[PDB]
Design a protein around this motif. Structure first.
Motif, PDB file in Angstrom:
ATOM      1  N   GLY B 298      43.358  43.294  52.884  1.00  0.00           N
ATOM      2  CA  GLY B 298      42.374  42.242  52.976  1.00  0.00           C
ATOM      3  C   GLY B 298      40.962  42.756  52.722  1.00  0.00           C
ATOM      4  N   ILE B 299      40.012  41.817  52.756  1.00  0.00           N
ATOM      5  CA  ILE B 299      38.603  42.167  52.600  1.00  0.00           C
ATOM      6  C   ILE B 299      38.116  42.968  53.801  1.00  0.00           C
ATOM      7  N   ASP B 300      38.588  42.611  54.999  1.00  0.00           N
ATOM      8  CA  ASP B 300      38.211  43.348  56.199  1.00  0.00           C
ATOM      9  C   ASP B 300      38.861  44.726  56.244  1.00  0.00           C
ATOM     10  N   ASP B 301      40.075  44.856  55.704  1.00  0.00           N
ATOM     11  CA  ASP B 301      40.733  46.156  55.666  1.00  0.00           C
ATOM     12  C   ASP B 301      40.099  47.077  54.630  1.00  0.00           C
ATOM     13  N   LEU B 302      39.656  46.522  53.500  1.00  0.00           N
ATOM     14  CA  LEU B 302      38.973  47.324  52.491  1.00  0.00           C
ATOM     15  C   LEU B 302      37.503  47.541  52.831  1.00  0.00           C
ATOM     16  N   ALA B 303      36.974  46.791  53.803  1.00  0.00           N
ATOM     17  CA  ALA B 303      35.586  46.964  54.226  1.00  0.00           C
ATOM     18  C   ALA B 303      35.362  48.254  55.009  1.00  0.00           C
ATOM     19  N   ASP B 304      36.433  48.938  55.424  1.00  0.00           N
ATOM     20  CA  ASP B 304      36.298  50.218  56.117  1.00  0.00           C
ATOM     21  C   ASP B 304      35.722  51.300  55.212  1.00  0.00           C
ATOM     22  N   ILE B 305      35.931  51.186  53.902  1.00  0.00           N
ATOM     23  CA  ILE B 305      35.361  52.105  52.927  1.00  0.00           C
ATOM     24  C   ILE B 305      33.992  51.578  52.516  1.00  0.00           C
ATOM     25  N   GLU B 306      32.966  52.421  52.661  1.00  0.00           N
ATOM     26  CA  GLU B 306      31.604  51.997  52.348  1.00  0.00           C
ATOM     27  C   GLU B 306      31.361  51.911  50.849  1.00  0.00           C
ATOM     28  N   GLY B 307      32.199  52.573  50.043  1.00  0.00           N
ATOM     29  CA  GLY B 307      32.044  52.509  48.598  1.00  0.00           C
ATOM     30  C   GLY B 307      32.301  51.132  48.019  1.00  0.00           C
ATOM     31  N   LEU B 308      33.156  50.347  48.663  1.00  0.00           N
ATOM     32  CA  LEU B 308      33.444  48.986  48.237  1.00  0.00           C
ATOM     33  C   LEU B 308      32.735  47.993  49.147  1.00  0.00           C
ATOM     34  N   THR B 309      32.171  46.951  48.545  1.00  0.00           N
ATOM     35  CA  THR B 309      31.523  45.873  49.272  1.00  0.00           C
ATOM     36  C   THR B 309      32.512  44.733  49.486  1.00  0.00           C
ATOM     37  N   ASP B 310      32.104  43.763  50.312  1.00  0.00           N
ATOM     38  CA  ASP B 310      32.985  42.647  50.652  1.00  0.00           C
ATOM     39  C   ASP B 310      33.273  41.768  49.441  1.00  0.00           C
ATOM     40  N   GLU B 311      32.263  41.542  48.595  1.00  0.00           N
ATOM     41  CA  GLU B 311      32.468  40.760  47.379  1.00  0.00           C
ATOM     42  C   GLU B 311      33.313  41.528  46.368  1.00  0.00           C
ATOM     43  N   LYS B 312      33.084  42.841  46.257  1.00  0.00           N
ATOM     44  CA  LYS B 312      33.860  43.656  45.326  1.00  0.00           C
ATOM     45  C   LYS B 312      35.305  43.809  45.789  1.00  0.00           C
ATOM     46  N   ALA B 313      35.518  43.979  47.100  1.00  0.00           N
ATOM     47  CA  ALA B 313      36.879  44.042  47.628  1.00  0.00           C
ATOM     48  C   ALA B 313      37.581  42.700  47.497  1.00  0.00           C
ATOM     49  N   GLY B 314      36.841  41.598  47.663  1.00  0.00           N
ATOM     50  CA  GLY B 314      37.424  40.284  47.449  1.00  0.00           C
ATOM     51  C   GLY B 314      37.815  40.041  46.003  1.00  0.00           C
ATOM     52  N   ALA B 315      36.963  40.467  45.064  1.00  0.00           N
ATOM     53  CA  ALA B 315      37.286  40.342  43.645  1.00  0.00           C
ATOM     54  C   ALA B 315      38.464  41.223  43.253  1.00  0.00           C
ATOM     55  N   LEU B 316      38.551  42.434  43.815  1.00  0.00           N
ATOM     56  CA  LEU B 316      39.671  43.318  43.510  1.00  0.00           C
ATOM     57  C   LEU B 316      40.975  42.795  44.100  1.00  0.00           C
ATOM     58  N   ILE B 317      40.920  42.238  45.314  1.00  0.00           N
ATOM     59  CA  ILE B 317      42.112  41.669  45.940  1.00  0.00           C
ATOM     60  C   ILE B 317      42.571  40.428  45.185  1.00  0.00           C
ATOM     61  N   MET B 318      41.617  39.604  44.732  1.00  0.00           N
ATOM     62  CA  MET B 318      41.959  38.419  43.950  1.00  0.00           C
ATOM     63  C   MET B 318      42.538  38.794  42.590  1.00  0.00           C
ATOM     64  N   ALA B 319      42.007  39.849  41.967  1.00  0.00           N
ATOM     65  CA  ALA B 319      42.534  40.306  40.682  1.00  0.00           C
ATOM     66  C   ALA B 319      43.938  40.880  40.833  1.00  0.00           C
ATOM     67  N   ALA B 320      44.180  41.623  41.918  1.00  0.00           N
ATOM     68  CA  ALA B 320      45.509  42.180  42.156  1.00  0.00           C
ATOM     69  C   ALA B 320      46.518  41.086  42.497  1.00  0.00           C
ATOM     70  N   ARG B 321      46.091  40.080  43.267  1.00  0.00           N
ATOM     71  CA  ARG B 321      46.972  38.956  43.582  1.00  0.00           C
ATOM     72  C   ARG B 321      47.259  38.111  42.347  1.00  0.00           C
ATOM     73  N   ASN B 322      46.284  37.988  41.443  1.00  0.00           N
ATOM     74  CA  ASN B 322      46.514  37.262  40.197  1.00  0.00           C
ATOM     75  C   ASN B 322      47.432  38.042  39.266  1.00  0.00           C
ATOM     76  N   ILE B 323      47.326  39.373  39.271  1.00  0.00           N
ATOM     77  CA  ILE B 323      48.218  40.197  38.455  1.00  0.00           C
ATOM     78  C   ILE B 323      49.634  40.164  39.013  1.00  0.00           C
ATOM     79  N   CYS B 324      49.766  40.058  40.337  1.00  0.00           N
ATOM     80  CA  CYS B 324      51.087  39.971  40.949  1.00  0.00           C
ATOM     81  C   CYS B 324      51.714  38.597  40.722  1.00  0.00           C
TER      82      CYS B 324
END
Lengths: 54, 330, 225, 205, 156
Positions: B298-324
């Protein structure tokens, strides 16, 4: 804040946002199994006719 | 595609922009979209006669159908008040548009000429202490004050959005209370990577790391003759700059040594669009291995890494879910 | 960008006869060969370059340029220049109050457009012969006058001019509104209304062409940027 | 030496509420406050430059109840004094004993206050002062004397005042019926609608 | 935000074959209560139209005036045609001591405190112009410093 706002939006529109999780999708399915919410409805904004202001 | 709170029944007269001819059963039909800025863009044109006489052109439009509003109005060497030509005395050509087809808080924002003031005068209705325009990446820093910050921010950032949209470029609000703190941090806590560039000593590093050493992050393009005004000689250091380039090549080799080039498996997470090798390593460091495993996070689970932001983690999760989900389609 | 040698070849350095000069052009004049004034190319070139730069800058922010030249020798050329960089122009007589009185001229433009549409897109034909002829004439008139500026929409953000004394009306209009002016200014002309004066031979065709071409190039560059 | 006629007429003429009646009953109920007095009230053409100034002058004069010569004198005094002229004039006007009394709340109207002053009800620093134009100074306590302390009108006035906003530049005691004129009022403390500048201009013809 | 004062309106005639064609001239002036001022002179067969025209004229071609607080920066003379005008900065409280057309222009400009006499002609149109000129020419301390290559404290 209200589940009426959840019923106003489609489940596909909620699935296109990563704010919901994989377990949150299962919880949403468990909530929609009672068919009271997330049934793909459309409201005016909030209020039905039975929900009238008085 | 309707308006905000503006609600009514049968008999209510209202205009609407139409351009969606969709054919249906037993003849074709047509729908209307009276909630865009175009409708409100020409709204002032019908009122303000100067707009139709090419006296006040509209640089851009950024209103909120149901919220506030902000438009562009700048005269062409006619020496005439931009907002004064649409208001003057008891501005009746502003309230009318405000409560026309949708009670919107229209805030005509006049523009200047300089790009620094291009946004400094677009803070209305508010003041401006300074400005931090970043001519590079999509980032900005509104330098005003807490008192006007609330009025400059609004509610959900409508003001910011409107301003940025009206300006055409980016626009981000910020605080100026730590002006004497951020300055030392940018030239105090950011002075961090000088030893890696110009070779130094532990003593010079150790009293110049937790507090910043010196050197010049790519500062050789800037005039280094002003450093000759300081004491000491710096004749050979340019050659050290070339050594830095050699180190950069080693750094480039490191940019490929990351976990032996992302090991060799997965490939689904590494070839995902919008993510680099370092971002894929940072995402996979939390136990994920494949793109489906990244979609499970999730966005909250990927928010533990400071390199990724909440919007960037949301876009990456949405892209991975769309690819799946759309993996059946090529 | 444009070299001195090239300019010389063109005939930029030549000016008007000494009796027709303006004493406000005394700084830009070098000397007088055979009782004809010679423009100082050392002072001209940098100015020209600056002007070009300015033009480029204007282009970069999506500026609308207007190319004015109603001499009738370089009417063909100015139009060409305009079209190369897809900008607007006034190659035939400048209508008094084109810019200052835009709102009236906007109606004229609209009319012209309508006429054009009727001519081309309609394909109706079947029109009374005299009436049709009249319409055609009208169209011709409009095209000649406002052909270059039909797609301008509003007012231009800069104004390039081939002769200041000849197009003084235009220049004046640009000053009243505050539009930047980029005038080619021979020794007889007045440079006071002009913002970015270019000391050079308005009359000679080759020189004019040269002046146009560089400007066009710069505009294109700006657009690209 | 006083205006003895209809009070609301004056107010009507001015346009505003001049506070020439106590304020138990609202001014809109008592009279057509919008409509000007006389047969030709409903007609209202824009006034001249001189005329507006004159009107303004009248308003101020009306408010305090000061006739013309006295007003002129006051203006002159203000001019003489250091600082802003209009402001000075205003201060002077305020300083009047009757006005002060009114502010305190021992008179329902300014007229009432004036009357009280006349009738040897009021004392300034324990000495009976009879003059309505008496300029009350800073730190000058001003009180009702023991004879006039029993009057029902005074208490009514006080009550009225209590409903009305209290001025910052005074300090009054309802039980003791004595107020201290602490300082001469600042322009900010007074009403914003009064264009003193117009008045000043009128006399600077 | 802009305040606008119609100074004068005057009926002017043109004689023709039939008789006299009458028309009306409106002299207005507008300002934002700060430096910006602009007068407009409009003309039409009916008064209101003329006034409107004047207002329109005024609103474009405005002019900025450097104002030290409520008053002017120094005594300034301004002339135009017959009307020659003197205006002098004055202490807070004094008000606009000025006559006629001149007063109006000052008021809109957002000068509150002036001592101003109109010598010569007092033809409203000319006098307003004169006033405007005077205002325009009037330089500030900062401006003067800039001109002279000095600081503001050097000039005092």
């Amino acid at each position: 804040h209200y589940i009426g706002d959840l019923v106003q939006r489609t489940e596909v529109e909620l699935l296109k946002t990563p704010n919901l999780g994989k377990k949150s999708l299962t919880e949403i399915k468990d909530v929609l199994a009672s068919r009271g919410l997330s049934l793909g409805m459309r409201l005016e904004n909030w209020p039905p006719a039975s929900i009238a202001d008085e | 595609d309707m308006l905000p709170r503006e609600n009514f029944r049968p008999g209510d007269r209202v205009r609407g922009v139409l351009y969606s001819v969709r054919p249906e059963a037993r003849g074709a039909q047509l729908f209307v979209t009276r909630s865009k800025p175009e409708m409100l863009i020409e709204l002032f044109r019908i009122e303000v006669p100067e707009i139709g006489e090419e006296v006040i052109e509209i640089k851009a439009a950024a209103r909120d159908p149901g919220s506030r509003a902000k438009i562009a109005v700048k005269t062409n060497d006619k020496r005439i008040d931009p907002v004064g030509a649409c208001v003057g005395m008891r501005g009746a050509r502003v309230q009318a548009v405000s409560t026309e087809l949708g009670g919107e808080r229209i805030d005509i924002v006049l523009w200047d000429d300089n790009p620094a003031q291009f946004v400094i005068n677009a803070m209305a209705p508010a003041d401006v202490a300074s400005i931090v325009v970043d001519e590079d990446k999509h980032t900005m820093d509104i330098a005003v004050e807490a008192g006007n910050l609330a009025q400059a921010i609004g509610r959900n950032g409508q003001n910011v959005r409107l301003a940025s949209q009206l300006s055409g470029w980016e626009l981000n609000v910020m605080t100026v209370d730590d002006l004497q703190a951020k300055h030392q941090a940018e030239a105090h806590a950011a002075i961090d990577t000088f030893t890696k560039y110009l070779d130094i000593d532990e003593d010079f590093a150790t009293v110049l790391v937790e507090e910043g050493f010196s050197t010049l992050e790519e500062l050789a393009y800037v005039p280094m003759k002003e450093l000759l005004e300081i004491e000491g000689l710096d004749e050979p250091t340019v050659e050290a700059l070339r050594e830095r380039a050699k180190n950069a090549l080693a750094t480039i080799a490191q940019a490929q040594e990351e976990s032996l080039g992302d090991n060799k498996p997965a490939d689904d997470l590494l070839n995902l669009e919008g993510v680099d090798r370092d971002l894929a390593f940072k995402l996979a460091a939390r136990g994920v291995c494949t793109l489906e495993d990244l979609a499970e996070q999730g966005i909250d689970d990927l928010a533990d890494i400071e390199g990724l932001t909440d919007e960037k983690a949301g876009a990456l999760i949405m892209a991975a879910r769309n690819i799946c989900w759309f993996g059946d389609e090529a | 960008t444009v070299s001195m040698r090239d300019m010389l070849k063109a005939g930029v350095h030549f000016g008007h006869q000494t009796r027709y000069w303006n004493p406000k052009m005394k700084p830009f004049i070098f000397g007088a060969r055979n009782k004809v004034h010679i423009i100082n190319l050392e002072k001209t070139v940098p100015m020209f370059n600056e002007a070009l730069a300015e033009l480029n800058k204007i282009a970069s922010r999506k500026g609308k340029i207007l190319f004015v030249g109603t001499k009738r020798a370089a009417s063909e050329a100015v139009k060409d220049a305009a079209l190369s960089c897809d900008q607007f122009f006034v190659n035939h007589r400048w209508l008094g109050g084109m810019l200052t009185n835009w709102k009236t001229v906007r109606q004229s433009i609209k009319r012209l457009k309508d006429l054009e549409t009727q001519s081309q897109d309609g394909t109706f034909d079947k029109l009374t012969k005299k009436e049709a002829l009249m319409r055609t004439r009208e169209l011709e008139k409009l095209e000649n006058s406002l052909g270059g500026i039909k797609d301008m929409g509003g007012l231009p953000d800069a104004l390039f001019v081939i002769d200041a004394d000849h197009e003084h009306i235009a220049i004046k209009e640009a000053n009243n509104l505050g539009i930047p002016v980029f005038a080619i200014v021979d020794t007889n002309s007045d440079p006071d209304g002009v913002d970015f004066v270019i000391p050079g031979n308005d009359d000679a065709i080759r020189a004019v062409t040269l002046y146009l071409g560089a400007v066009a190039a710069t505009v294109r560059e700006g657009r690209s940027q | 030496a006083r205006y003895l006629g209809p009070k609301l007429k004056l107010s009507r003429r001015e346009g505003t509420d001049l506070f020439l009646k106590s304020g138990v009953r609202a001014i809109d109920t008592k009279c057509k406050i919008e409509q000007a007095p006389g047969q030709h009230g409903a007609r209202k053409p824009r006034l001249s430059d001189y005329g507006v100034q004159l009107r303004e002058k009248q308003k101020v004069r009306r408010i305090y109840g000061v006739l013309e010569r006295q007003f002129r004198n006051y203006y002159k005094e203000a001019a003489r004094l250091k600082g802003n002229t209009g402001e000075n004039l205003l201060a002077l006007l305020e300083g009047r004993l009757d006005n002060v009394v009114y502010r305190m709340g021992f008179g329902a109207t300014r007229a009432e206050a004036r009357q009280l002053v006349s009738h040897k009800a009021i004392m300034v620093n324990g000495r009976v002062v009879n003059i309505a134009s008496y300029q009350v100074s800073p730190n000058d306590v001003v009180s009702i004397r023991e004879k006039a302390k029993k009057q029902s009108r005074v208490k009514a006035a006080l009550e009225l005042a209590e409903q009305r906003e209290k001025p910052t530049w005074l300090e009054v005691d309802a039980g003791k019926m004595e107020g201290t004129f602490k300082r001469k009022p600042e322009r900010s403390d007074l009403s914003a609608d009064i264009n003193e500048h117009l008045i000043v201009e009128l006399y600077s013809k | 935000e802009l305040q606008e004062k119609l100074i004068a309106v005057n009926r002017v005639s043109k004689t023709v074959k039939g008789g006299r064609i009458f028309s009306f001239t409106a002299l207005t002036v507008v300002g934002d209560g700060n430096g910006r001022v602009g007068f407009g002179y409009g003309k039409a067969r009916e008064v209101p139209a003329a006034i409107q025209k004047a207002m329109e004229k005024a609103r474009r071609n405005m002019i900025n005036v450097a104002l030290n607080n409520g008053t002017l920066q120094h005594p300034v003379k301004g002339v135009h045609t017959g009307s020659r005008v003197f205006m002098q900065p004055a202490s807070e409280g004094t008000g606009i001591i000025a006559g006629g057309a001149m007063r109006a222009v000052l008021e809109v400009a957002g000068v509150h405190n002036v001592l101003a006499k109109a010598y010569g002609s007092t033809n409203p149109i000319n006098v307003v112009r004169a006033t405007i000129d005077g205002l325009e020419n009037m330089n500030s301390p900062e401006m003067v410093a800039a001109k002279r290559g000095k600081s503001v404290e050097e000039i005092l």
